[PDB]
Design a protein around this nucleic acid. Structure first.
Lengths: 131, 85, 92, 57, 164, 64
RNA sequence: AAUAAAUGAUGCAGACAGUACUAGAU
RNA sequence: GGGGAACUUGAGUGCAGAAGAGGAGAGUGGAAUUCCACGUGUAGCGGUGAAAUGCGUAGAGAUGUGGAGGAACACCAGUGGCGAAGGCGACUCUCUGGUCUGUAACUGACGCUGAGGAGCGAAAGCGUGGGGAGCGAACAGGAUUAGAUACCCUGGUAGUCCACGCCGUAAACGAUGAGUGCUAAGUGUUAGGGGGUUUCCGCCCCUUAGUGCUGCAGCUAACGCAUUAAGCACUCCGCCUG
């Protein structure tokens, strides 16, 4: 069942951050790979790798702690839940903490962040926030 | 036991090793429900067996709905073969 | 598979005991219950008292029937005075 | 009651010494002494889980 | 790290609650003092004190607050981003405001924000109105704030890369 | 202590074993506890079954 | 020739007010 | 989201095993209580804080034998086990439900929840016909108290039991809805599996589902919870607004 893979992915990442872990294993769907690569290019993660196996495929995430003891991903939160979908327009694209954070948004042309969607003049599902 | 199942399997086997066979599971559930009602017609107070029969019937109904949504031809064939009316 | 063990009253001659044994065996075979094994412990002192005796003859029989000659043997032993106690168990 | 075993060639209290010790392994002190007044099934069940574990006896 | 108390401070009390202890003889009354000490350059702290006298309790609370100072970002005389504190059933949100809005908050939160040097903040309490918990939640929310340059250094990016 | 059935690798008690049932039952007739006999839970349950069947078949006493 | 530590179950005690009562300031 | 085509991890079938107070039905059992009959046998028996009501010289209690009948199943027995919940504890048998272990052979999303509805549903209670050993509301008597329509004692109806039907309520509680995923540890325990020497007995490690205690982070008003969450998240249902 599980009703959604993305929310559980985000919560697993949040628990990993809370415990100060260094690795994770996820069934690694296409959208999950996309979000992980976005976080990678955003500096939230040290490195990410894909493991295409026979069962479904697996992805490993390496949490980032650039300094002595600091959680890069302080918190996460999903919005477009399965039962209350959220769609934001180009003019209503939000910004996380005055542009300090980042929010993932699937748009008409690929999956992009808030700033990328604002630049490209698009909009769609606001499926997650990041702080 | 170990005879009715084997016969139903050999009868409803579409392939050499087809044992998932929603039709086979339906036939097995039907024969089990019949054997259960046989004794429930006398031990009317065994409510736990009635709950088990309700569970089996729910499984049967879900399988029948799946088969109807998947292949109406095979659904109607199973109907004509078993008489599950 | 099934197992049958029963107790015969002690005050019985050898010929009468054998006659009763054959009678009950025939009763069991009334449906075709093959007797796959037999054992006679003999004279053993009972741990506790029964109707009129402290000892008796123990008889063991192995059977593979359809649970009908079992009931026949049960209702016959409960009625007949030759047997005092008896129990049928599955050898599974 | 302790047992049916007999002992002789001792004193009067030497027998009671072993009586009071062997009576522990019999229900004469528990089984025949608890059932003086009724106990509800609930408390009846909880009494075992309490005593047999806490080792209060 | 711990901030030194060697600075000019505008120590200002909030409330003085009178508590009583019951004894064989009767009730023994003591005074509890809440005080907020800080400067208007981004450093503030909270302390408390108890004694049978008002001035002694005030002095003890001031001395304790001196040892519990904390730093707060002052991006544009305001906070870099909104945040909420949730210390002990006390929920208080803090939003950044323009240059002319002013400090808007209930007594204790307003005092804490003023003594910290912030002039334009939007606040709203969404929980208990107890002053201790109010101050604690405000302090927690201010501690959970992050600077733009700090976040840029942490995420291995440039300030402009984040602000645009 | 050490269990008997495990040490011997034996199978179903075969209640006919009057000597085993006797030496495993108290001198009075009461069933000895597991903490004293050293047997496992499964073997203790089988022991109870066997001793009950024996008592039913006059192979062991009820009272002594 | 020696020599044992026990045993325990206590009967009775109902009510008390309507209105009353201490503070403290950088 | 709809339609089309593939996949197994979800889901289910089979394969070889495992435990269990799982249920309905039939038979059997020996302790123990009561009564009856008889042999021995006298002045008491039973009971309370004390006492009395009660039974006993038409011969009690006690002791020993036999019989009659009815309920429950000592020791095993252990936060042990099963069941969706209530609940389920002697033995034997007939008919039956679910669960766990390696599943990989099989179908390949067939899954979760579920208003309304149906069914089940402690004890008590009601109706029909039986049965009634002990216990025992109501009731009678004897005590205490100022009073006792009670707490104590002696008797004692219905009830407790059996077949059918009805009622559908409990502190029916873990005062914690169902499903899934993630989140340090030590620790016993039930039924299994694999292994590192041993044929073993047994020691250790690993791995499944369940049952218990102490405890990190985290949560919480605190109490406390903490891989069986009251932690971190998603889906559905019922409920709350002095």
């Amino acid at each position: 069942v599980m009703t959604d893979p993305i929310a559980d992915m985000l919560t697993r990442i949040r628990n990993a951050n809370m415990v100060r872990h260094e690795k994770l294993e996820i069934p690694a769907s296409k959208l999950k790979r996309e979000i992980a690569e976005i976080l990678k290019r955003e500096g939230f993660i040290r490195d990410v790798e894909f493991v295409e196996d026979s069962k479904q495929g697996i992805i490993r995430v390496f949490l980032k702690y650039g300094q002595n003891n600091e959680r890069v991903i302080t918190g996460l939160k999903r919005i477009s839940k399965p039962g209350l979908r959220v769609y934001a327009k180009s003019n209503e694209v939000p910004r996380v903490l005055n542009g300090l954070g980042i929010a993932i948004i699937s748009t008409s042309q690929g999956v992009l962040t808030d700033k990328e969607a604002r630049a490209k003049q698009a909009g769609g599902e606001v499926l997650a926030y990041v702080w | 036991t170990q005879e009715r199942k084997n016969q139903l399997i050999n009868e409803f086997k579409t392939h050499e090793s087809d044992t998932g066979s929603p039709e086979v599971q339906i036939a097995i559930l039907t024969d089990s429900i019949n054997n259960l009602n046989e004794h429930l017609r006398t031990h009317k107070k065994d409510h736990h067996s009635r709950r088990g029969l309700l569970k089996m019937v729910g499984k049967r109904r879900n399988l029948l709905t799946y088969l109807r949504n998947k292949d109406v031809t095979r659904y109607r064939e199973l109907i004509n073969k078993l008489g599950l009316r | 598979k099934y197992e049958v063990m029963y107790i015969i009253r002690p005050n019985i001659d050898e010929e009468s005991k054998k006659a009763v044994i054959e009678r009950f065996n025939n009763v069991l075979t009334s449906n075709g219950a093959e007797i796959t094994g037999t054992k006679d412990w003999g004279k053993r002192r009972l741990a506790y008292e029964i109707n009129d005796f402290r000892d008796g003859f123990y008889q063991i029989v192995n059977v593979q029937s359809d649970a009908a000659a079992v009931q026949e043997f049960d209702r016959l032993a409960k009625i007949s005075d030759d047997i005092i106690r008896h129990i049928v168990v599955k050898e599974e | 009651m302790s047992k049916t075993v007999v002992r002789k060639n001792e004193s009067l209290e030497d027998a009671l010494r072993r009586f009071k010790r062997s009576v522990s392994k019999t229900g004469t002190l528990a089984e025949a002494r608890k059932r003086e007044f009724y106990e509800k099934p609930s408390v009846k069940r909880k009494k075992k889980s309490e005593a047999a574990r806490k080792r209060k006896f | 790290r711990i901030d030194p108390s060697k600075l000019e401070l505008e120590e200002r009390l909030v409330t003085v609650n009178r508590v009583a202890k019951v004894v064989k003889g009767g009730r023994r009354f003591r005074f509890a003092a809440l005080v907020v000490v800080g400067d208007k350059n981004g450093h503030v702290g909270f302390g408390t004190g108890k004694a049978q006298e008002v001035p002694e309790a005030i002095r003890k609370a001031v001395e304790d607050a001196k040892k519990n100072l904390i730093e707060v970002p002052m991006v544009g005389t305001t906070i870099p981003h909104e945040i909420i504190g949730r210390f002990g059933a006390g929920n208080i949100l803090l939003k950044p405001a323009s240059e002319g809005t002013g400090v808007i908050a209930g007594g204790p939160v307003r005092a804490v924000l003023e003594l910290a040097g912030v002039a334009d903040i939007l606040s709203k309490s969404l929980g208990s109105n107890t002053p201790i918990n109010m101050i604690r939640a405000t302090l927690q929310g201010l501690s959970e704030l992050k600077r733009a340059e700090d976040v840029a250094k942490l995420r291995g990016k440039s300030v402009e890369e984040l602000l645009g | 202590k050490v269990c008997y059935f495990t040490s011997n690798g034996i199978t179903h008690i075969d209640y006919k074993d009057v000597d085993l049932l006797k030496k495993f039952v108290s001198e009075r007739g009461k069933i000895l506890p597991r903490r004293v006999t050293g047997t496992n839970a499964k073997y203790q349950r089988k022991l109870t079954a066997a001793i009950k069947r024996a008592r039913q078949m006059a192979l062991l006493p009820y009272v002594s």
